[PDB]
Scaffold this active site. Structure first.
Site, PDB file in Angstrom:
ATOM      1  N   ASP A  92     -35.307  37.184   1.896  1.00 10.95           N
ATOM      2  CA  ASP A  92     -35.913  36.416   2.904  1.00 10.95           C
ATOM      3  C   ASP A  92     -36.811  37.347   3.720  1.00 10.95           C
ATOM      4  OD1 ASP A  92     -36.180  34.407   4.798  1.00 10.95           O
ATOM      5  OD2 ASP A  92     -35.023  35.574   6.154  1.00 10.95           O
ATOM      6  N   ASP A 150     -38.176  36.683   7.479  1.00  6.76           N
ATOM      7  CA  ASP A 150     -38.099  36.720   8.926  1.00  6.76           C
ATOM      8  C   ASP A 150     -36.677  37.023   9.410  1.00  6.76           C
ATOM      9  OD1 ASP A 150     -40.932  36.150   9.334  1.00  6.76           O
ATOM     10  OD2 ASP A 150     -40.518  34.303   8.257  1.00  6.76           O
TER      11      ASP A 150
HETATM   12 CO   LIG Z   1     -34.850  34.641   7.989  1.00  7.37          CO
HETATM   13 OS   LIG Z   2     -37.011  32.738   6.481  1.00  7.58          OS
END
Ligand SMILES: [Co+2]
Ligand SMILES: [Os+3]
Ligand SMILES: [Co+2]
Ligand SMILES: [Co+2]
Ligand SMILES: [Co+2]
Ligand SMILES: [Os+3]
Ligand SMILES: [Os+3]
Ligand SMILES: [Os+3]
Ligand SMILES: [Os+3]
Ligand SMILES: [Os+3]
Ligand SMILES: [Os+3]
Ligand SMILES: [Os+3]
Lengths: 208, 208, 209, 209
Positions: free
Chosen positions: C41, C43
């Site tokens: 992922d 962020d």
């Molecule tokens: Co994230």
């Molecule tokens: Os994300």
């Protein structure tokens, strides 16, 4: 320093430990039939430091002599455990293993004595039904004895709970699940072991 | 080690810190009339590392050169703070000091620039009423400037909040109350300071 | 709440039962496994991108989360605002480790697709990912109540997926990959923080920076 | 409660606002003050005496707290059962510090008085307290809703009182002495643990052993 200070990297920092709860252990065992499980005694199910502290200052105030002194053992194994404080983590584990119908074993490195009332102290404190209870096993390396590991294999113990490194390795050497309980910081048995040093499960909050 | 392990002395261990809460600070000030208070900016009320990180990799990828580079300052002081994230601890302190009718000052070691929009970024993010707000003070040791300490004395600032050692000592040198806020562990300004190193108050949970 | 709450040593020592792990433990657990695809992922997993999201909120929907389905926001977020995004040390450590391994590295993100994106470049640069390990960022969306990641993890045969949100862990679980949690920093603007460990998944120690 | 509760970094870093102090900080705060009287609670302050209390409970009132007003219990507790009581390291450190200072050291306890007591000897011996610093243990009682300590602290002009219970801290406060908290160990049988710090008092770090 007089004022060390701190920072939030330090405040948040975690050791990489396989922490588990009693509920997770029981979940992990869902549907497995009755089996034999074992417990170390000292700092695992009894905070026995009161008797050991009194042994050291009665029998070898300046050494660890007392642990090879039969006069001490005879006292420690025959009623000094009335001052030992039962661990709540052990109450929780023992109740759950009794509920499973498991057989409960205690395997100890304490020196063997002519008689012992430790078995009864345990069964009484932890309310272990006759049908789940087994006399304490004194394990070790004196002539005639078997090691902790041997007794685990002999009894088919599949899970062994203990606070010391040697409890975990004794279980691992025979392919049992060795689960760590935290030694209390007020134990007189020092240094405290590094719980989790072998990547083993460690029970949260199991110092009391 | 691959599996360091841990023990409960270590798990329970506390640094001897004068931790305080915002509510305790306000309680400590009960009945004291309007006074002037001051805040460091960076890592105290703004997580400004986004602008500083982008300055270092735009202006001196391999050094700390950028902090003496006027092209950086002009960018940092004129809108890069739109990417700075306000600290909740600062929202709480600033609301309480506004409620008291205190005067709010920001005193910064950032390099001065021809113009600055930092004052407006702060007043807007923290909702500081005109009557409590004061333009950011650029303090330091370049020709023509006054030090942090001088500006505290000049403005009669009785309490100075800050994350760096020099914020606390600047307050102490003039007899103000210097209160420590924790620098976030993801700041690019490293090493993190030892909060509490001078026996000063440190605000709990003030990393965010 | 009370002015002087006080505390006690049961509370001070108390631990939640989490499968904490270190990067070294993860690397050891993979010793002798040949190159494979792994995924991250973005962020709060590899980038503290809250600067751009905060700016976007304030610019485009100060009183709400409408900016997150506003194309003009995504165009800014994906084409330069990650210049203010701070790389996480946990990510540098994990990405170096997977490169050592010869693994293929994917980024799978629920950020919305845009016409162009300089996020792939930012990541490759920041983490010094060689061309052979690097793959173009996969922009999967949100779309409640679908997990738009799972199908990508299946498509790329990703065997390990690192992430800070519950859906990163369940995407992995949906495909039989090993989902590994990174802690979201407490100064993220993405609130509330998730309960890392809430699926019995491994959680990387100290992974908030 | 949930099988995998998980956690997050706000929770992991979170601190209660407590005036923590170290023995060295306390010693520094007293630098240049001439000899004075200071006082300690006994149970969970200097001695982990739970062994004897546990034994007493089990012997004399297994299903209740009646043992604590049973004279036959007190006679055992005060005349040998502290041979199983484990001295606290915090206490050794503080008592050595006060001896260094030339302070007079008092023990003030809510244990009930008995005909004889070997607790004074146990403490003097265990903590190597010289005769000039040592004072006979003061056995004050419980008696709800009176604090039976306060009057002793006034009588002896005690200026600092260490203790683990709320009433140790309030006894001190009642007389204008400086009340200093020691943490009660989590394996004490005296439950629940008090909220150390709940009066804004100093709490000694790591003082559970
Ligand atoms: Co994230
Ligand atoms: Os994300
Ligand atoms: Co043991
Ligand atoms: Co600062
Ligand atoms: Co007490
Ligand atoms: Os597990
Ligand atoms: Os043992
Ligand atoms: Os204070
Ligand atoms: Os500053
Ligand atoms: Os593991
Ligand atoms: Os202090
Ligand atoms: Os007492």
């Amino acid at each position: 320093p007089l004022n060390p200070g701190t920072n939030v990297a330090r405040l948040a920092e975690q050791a990489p430990i396989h922490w588990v709860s009693v509920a997770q252990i029981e979940n992990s065992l869902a549907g497995r039939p009755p089996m034999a499980v074992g417990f170390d005694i000292d700092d695992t199910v009894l905070f026995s430091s009161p008797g050991f502290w009194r042994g050291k200052k009665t029998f070898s105030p300046e050494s660890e002599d007392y642990l090879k002194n039969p006069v001490f053992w005879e006292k420690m194994n025959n009623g000094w455990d009335e001052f030992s404080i039962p661990k709540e983590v052990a109450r929780q584990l023992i109740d759950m293993h009794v509920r499973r119908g498991d057989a409960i074993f205690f395997v100890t490195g304490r020196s063997p004595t002519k008689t012992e009332t430790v078995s009864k102290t345990l069964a009484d404190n932890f309310h272990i039904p006759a049908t789940n209870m087994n006399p304490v096993i004194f394990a070790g390396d004196k002539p005639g004895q078997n090691t902790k590991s041997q007794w685990l294999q002999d009894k088919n113990i599949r899970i062994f709970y203990g606070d010391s490194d040697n409890d975990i390795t004794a279980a691992r050497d025979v392919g049992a699940r060795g689960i760590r309980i935290l030694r209390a910081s007020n134990s007189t048995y020092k240094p405290l072991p590094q719980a989790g040093a072998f990547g083993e499960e460690v029970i949260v909050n199991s110092e009391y």
